[PDB]
Design a protein around this ligand. Structure first.
Ligand SMILES: *C(=O)CCCCCCCCCCCCC
Length: 10
């Protein structure tokens, strides 16, 4: 959701 961009690593 909004974490949705870290657990995306890179
Ligand atoms: C929001 O919509 C995504 C939330 C990010 C953390 C939990 C979702 C996990 C599903 C995405 C797979 C990413 C690698 C586990």
């Amino acid at each position: 959701g909004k974490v949705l961009s870290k657990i995306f690593g890179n």
